[PDB]
């Protein structure tokens, strides 16, 4: 046996190469470690989270340091609309002179990368102006990461290891994370906007050297304590304000103008300050809801176990039995992780959907490649988080759910009609797939046969009505905010729609992404997205709800979350584990997010080109997507290098093929299965033993990758190729045609 892995004697006694593979795969599955107790489980997790937080801070420190060291932040300040931000320098000793010249751009005298993460726009909005300020922030994050690294070590020492009861105290954690982690942090950020960011946007420098004696508002804090809060909203930035200058600049620190700053085409800084002020108050209030040590406050266990509605006998909230759930969540780390991943997935989708439509950073809406990168980045991350939410939901069913303590509650009821849930999800998927694909190919045949007028073109009237209800007067509807006489627009009792004039100006502006005009081409792709959402949910939900077992495998819970199969008997049981459903769902998540990002990218490409008519007429049939989006926009990408020379797109050309290669390799792991390779490896084992001069010999017997391992490795190549191929195409097709 070997010392490695320390956490599994079963793996440590494995005499094959499978031991090394499985040690890395199960290293962070702390619950399955040898001799693991519940208290040691939480303590190890707590220190691990300190390490992850330090890694995040070091990562942010590296981004700041390389911009301050090798970027062009100060030059980019003077002309954000025409200067290309620099990510970092390039040192590839294999470059030739044509490659060196091609990557020497953006005002630099050495090869550089062009930043597409938007950190230049973000740091510019929050008041950073000099490379020294970026450098101090980078040094500060190095020390902050050191603090959390020490904290993780400290909370593993015997005197500072928290007890299991400390981890299980849900009510104090919710109070502190709502009021303090969310509320106080929001209040502190609003303070940074009021004290630093807003003055810097008006040509006034505020730093650590002078912020103590430089009030952000002339009225001072006296206006706050005397109830004269309206003084903070007086004299806002004028519509002719120039960012980073006092020309046309007001003095208000908390306005509620709405819309966009006319020059930067982004949200008002004073609006964002008042946003985080109001958010802080709401979250600090929410952080007092639950009882910790002073009697006042709700008890979550009591609320879930409650059976009386002001005297009347009820099953529970909404007349639904929620009893026994408090212990279910509080004892299941996978249940908690499922909610946390799902919440972050929705938050990441909302980030993508709301940052492109309402840009919060100065001039970031005019950096087309950055806009495409940020939307695609946060949607794909959201899709991965959504898969993880249901993956750990399936883990919860097997490992942490017991029917006895959940008898008759709402969680047990879901498991008792899983067939109805899965069958109806299957019906929605079949209905969407049959009709969405059928209407595409109907339009394909009509357009191909020179009969584009015979296409079925269903108008997205329901979504157009919502846009009109939000103030979009393009469609001619006269409802709600698009009707100036409507009670919604006037707000008849109070007329406090101080947001509406700014909001309507941004809504009806034709140069932004706020409620983009949609036609029949947009109708069909949302139904493709709905199909993708429902099928990916169907695969994940079916795997979670069948994790305990099915007719084919009644005792699946006794085999764990991830096992290869149950053998060829009973007809065959390939991909029967709940892990396999998550494995299959990643394929559908990638496909769905492919449709989502294809739609976002092509629509914005047409708008940025000035050729909106191309998308409107070609997106209604699939050949339009294949020809006018894929084939048409690949031309400049695939010419990054050619027999005539190389340009700055050579990296995206090479990475484009690199993604295709990784995608192709995945097919080998996914199509060919283990027994073929084990027999081949046996032949190579014979050859090595019979060959002279080959003094090496395996300490670990070479074996083919396991059945589950092959699915994971193939899925990893498939995903990496998926991301690399589209990322290269997304950057090259946008940056090659724009800044």
């Amino acid at each position: 046996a070997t010392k490695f892995p320390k956490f599994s004697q079963d793996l440590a006694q494995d005499p094959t190469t499978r031991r090394i593979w499985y040690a890395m795969a199960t290293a962070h599955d702390f619950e399955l470690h040898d001799g693991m107790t519940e208290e040691n489980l939480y303590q190890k997790i707590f220190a691990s989270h300190f390490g992850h937080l330090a890694i995040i801070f070091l990562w942010a420190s590296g981004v700041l340091f390389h911009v301050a060291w090798q970027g062009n932040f100060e030059q980019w300040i003077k002309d954000p609309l025409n200067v290309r931000p620099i990510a970092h320098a390039i040192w590839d000793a294999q470059f030739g002179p044509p490659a060196i010249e091609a990557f020497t751009r953006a005002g630099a005298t050495n090869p550089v990368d062009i930043c597409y993460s938007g950190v230049y726009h973000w740091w510019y909005t929050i008041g950073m102006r000099t490379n020294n300020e970026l450098y101090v922030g980078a040094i500060f994050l190095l020390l902050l990461a050191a603090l959390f690294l020490f904290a993780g070590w400290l909370h593993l020492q015997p005197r500072y290891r928290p007890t299991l009861g400390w981890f299980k105290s849900a009510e104090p954690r919710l109070n502190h994370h709502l009021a303090g982690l969310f509320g106080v942090s929001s209040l502190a950020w609003a303070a940074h906007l009021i004290h630093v960011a807003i003055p810097e946007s008006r040509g006034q420098h505020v730093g650590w050297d002078n912020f103590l004696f430089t009030p952000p508002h002339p009225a001072g804090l006296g206006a706050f304590f005397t109830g004269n809060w309206s003084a903070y909203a007086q004299n806002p930035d004028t519509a002719q304000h120039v960012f980073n200058s006092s020309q046309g600049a007001g003095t208000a620190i908390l306005t509620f103008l709405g819309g966009f700053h006319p020059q930067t085409q982004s949200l008002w800084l004073t609006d964002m300050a008042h946003h985080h002020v109001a958010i802080a108050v709401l979250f600090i209030i929410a952080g007092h809801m639950y009882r910790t040590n002073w009697g006042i406050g709700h008890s979550i266990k009591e609320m879930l176990n409650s059976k009386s509605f002001f005297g009347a006998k009820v099953e529970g909230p909404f007349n639904l039995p929620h009893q026994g759930l408090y212990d279910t969540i509080n004892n299941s780390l996978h249940f908690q992780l499922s909610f946390a991943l799902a919440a972050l997935g929705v938050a990441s989708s909302l980030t993508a959907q709301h940052m492109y439509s309402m840009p919060p950073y100065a001039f970031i809406g005019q950096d087309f490649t950055t806009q495409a990168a940020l939307y695609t980045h946060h949607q794909y991350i959201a899709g991965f988080l959504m898969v993880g939410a249901f993956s750990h939901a399936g883990i919860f069913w097997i490992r942490d759910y017991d029917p006895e303590q959940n008898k008759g509650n709402v969680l047990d009821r879901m498991l008792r009609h899983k067939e109805a849930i899965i069958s109806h999800l299957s019906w929605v998927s079949l209905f969407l797939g049959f009709h969405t694909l059928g209407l595409y190919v109907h339009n394909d045949v009509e357009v191909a046969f020179g009969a584009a007028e015979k296409q079925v073109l269903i108008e997205p009237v329901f979504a157009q009505f919502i846009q009109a209800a939000h103030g979009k007067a393009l469609y001619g509807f006269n409802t709600l905010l698009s009707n100036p006489d409507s009670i919604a627009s006037t707000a008849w009792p109070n007329h406090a729609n101080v947001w509406l004039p700014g909001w309507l100006d941004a809504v009806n502006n034709t140069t932004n992404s706020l409620f983009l005009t949609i036609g029949p081409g947009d109708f069909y792709v949302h139904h493709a997205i709905a199909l993708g959402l429902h099928v990916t949910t169907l695969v994940l939900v079916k795997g979670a709800l069948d994790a305990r077992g099915s007719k084919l495998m009644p005792d699946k819970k006794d085999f764990g979350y991830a096992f290869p199969c149950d053998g060829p008997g009973r007809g065959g049981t390939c991909d029967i584990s709940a892990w396999d459903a998550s494995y299959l769902a990643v394929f559908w998540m990638l496909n769905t997010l492919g449709w989502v990002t294809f739609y976002w990218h092509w629509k914005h490409l047409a708008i940025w080109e000035g050729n909106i008519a191309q998308f409107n007429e070609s997106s209604t049939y699939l050949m339009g997507w294949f020809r006018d989006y894929l084939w048409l926009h690949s031309a400049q990408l695939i010419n990054g290098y050619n027999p005539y020379g190389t340009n700055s797109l050579a990296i995206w050309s090479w990475m484009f093929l690199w993604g295709h290669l990784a995608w192709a390799v995945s097919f080998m792991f996914l199509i060919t299965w283990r027994g073929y390779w084990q027999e081949l490896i046996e032949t190579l084992v014979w050859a090595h033993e019979k060959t002279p001069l080959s003094f090496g010999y395996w300490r670990d017997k070479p074996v083919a990758l396991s059945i589950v391992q092959a699915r994971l490795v193939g899925l990893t190549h498939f995903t990496v190729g998926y991301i690399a191929t589209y990322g290269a195409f997304l950057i090259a097709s946008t940056a090659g045609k724009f800044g």
Binding site: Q94, F95, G96, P97, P98, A99, I100, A102, G640, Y641, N642, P643, G645, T646, A650, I651, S653, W654, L657
Partner: protein, 46 residues
């Protein structure tokens, strides 16, 4: 066979055509197939 194509893609992307496997760089002439063509052409007298 294939990894030398990957070699050619990387050399071309680097702007180093002289390091490629090509007629104008590091040549790989199929001399045996060229010899057969010359033999079969000279057999009939052409």
């Amino acid at each position: 066979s294939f990894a030398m194509y990957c070699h050619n893609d990387t050399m071309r992307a680097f702007g180093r055509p002289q390091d490629m496997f090509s007629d104008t760089g590091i040549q790989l002439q199929p001399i045996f197939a060229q010899w057969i063509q010359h033999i079969h052409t000279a057999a009939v007298g052409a």
